[PDB]
Design a protein around this ligand. Structure first.
Ligand code: UDP
Ligand code: MN
Length: 287
């Protein structure tokens, strides 16, 4: 029923990439008509899910801020379910939620290496999608916990498969992208190939699509382990390989996941989400 032109106007942002060669829109501030989309989705009575992992000190350092900002800005006006995965439920910061927000917490096993904690999310998310998320929501977003919502992050971001443009490389050329370049890895992307550099901090789509994204990425992660190699940027390297092979039906501009360390250039009109300063010395316990 919904057609791209119904809610997307690329001409509102002529100075940036608004359309991919495969006709997927790149959502920038100014190009979307949220009112039209809210009405459309509200009539379908959709529910949107959001998964977030917090293992170790990531809990105390970022979970409350993430949840509090999500409650305030994520898909306002629509039912939302926050799926919280932590290794220690007793440290779960139970904040007060607002209208249309609800949640559930799951205790997970903490992997030894932070690299595996980050990558195991792919296996875990898949298991939960099959077990219950597929029956609970129409769209699902999987996000890093080390970031905070700054403004409305709404229905204009929904789609079959959604990818996020990484803030530092959205204007670079593919051969400058930090893809995994070793042919021995399942995440390998040869120079001369690639569309964009996607950030693994945010990705989503329908439960069916996210299930395939996560399943394929974990298959690549497991394969590399058998070949004694680990992608340079772990799950992000694999996610980029996946989105190269299976193009996302929608892409979000850096405005949806911005790093203020860069400053605030002209292209970034309204920040919906921002990066948390890195604190590896404290939140990570290995290499
Ligand atoms: O010890 C760890 C490592 C990773 N994570 C989760 O995995 C995501 C990916 O990690 P990180 O944010 O450290 O990656 P970076 O964005 O800095 O590459 C984090 O946001 C967390 O949600 C976690 O909870 N504990
Ligand atoms: Mn992160």
């Amino acid at each position: 029923k919904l057609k791209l032109s119904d809610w997307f106007n690329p001409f509102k942002r002529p100075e940036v990439v608004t359309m991919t060669k495969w006709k997927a829109p790149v959502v920038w501030e100014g190009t979307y008509n949220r009112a039209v989309l809210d009405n459309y989705y509200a009539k379908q009575k959709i529910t949107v899910g959001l998964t977030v992992f917090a293992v170790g000190r990531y809990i105390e350092h970022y979970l409350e801020e993430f949840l509090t900002s999500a409650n305030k800005h994520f898909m306002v006006g629509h039912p939302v379910i926050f799926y919280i995965m932590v290794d220690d439920v007793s440290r779960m910061p139970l904040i007060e939620l607002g209208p249309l927000r609800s949640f559930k917490v799951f205790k997970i096993k903490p992997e030894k290496r932070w690299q595996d904690i980050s990558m195991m999310r792919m296996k875990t998310i898949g298991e939960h999608i099959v077990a219950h998320i597929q029956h609970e929501v129409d769209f699902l977003f999987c996000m890093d916990v080390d970031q905070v919502f700054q403004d409305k992050f709404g229905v204009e971001t929904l789609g079959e498969s959604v990818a996020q443009l990484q803030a530092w490389w959205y204007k670079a050329d593919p051969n400058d992208f930090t893809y995994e370049r070793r042919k021995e890895s399942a995440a390998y992307i040869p120079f001369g190939e690639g569309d964009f550099y996607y950030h693994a901090a945010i990705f989503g789509g329908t439960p069916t699509q996210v299930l395939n994204i996560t399943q394929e990425c974990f298959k690549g992660i497991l394969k590399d382990k058998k070949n004694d190699i680990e992608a340079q940027w772990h799950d992000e390297s694999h996610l980029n390989k996946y989105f190269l092979l299976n193009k996302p039906t929608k892409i979000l501009s850096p405005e949806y996941c911005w790093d203020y360390h860069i400053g605030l250039p002209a292209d970034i009109k309204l920040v919906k989400m921002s990066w948390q300063t890195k604190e590896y010395n404290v939140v990570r316990n290995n290499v």
